[PDB]
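quick one, two chains, predict together pls
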Amino acid sequence: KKLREVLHELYKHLDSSAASQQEYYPYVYYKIDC
Amino acid sequence: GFVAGVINRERIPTFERMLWRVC
């Protein structure tokens, strides 16, 4: 969660303009599990 | 050519942001 905020800081400037986020992130994400 | 919609400024911010993120 802290990483969600920090990576928000490190990836918001990719778009530089604005950025609910939902799965609309400024990064391309998927999950891997058991 | 490029088809142009018409909306009444009801919910343009959220809708257009959703368009920008979806595709």
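The radius of gyration of chain B is 10 Å.
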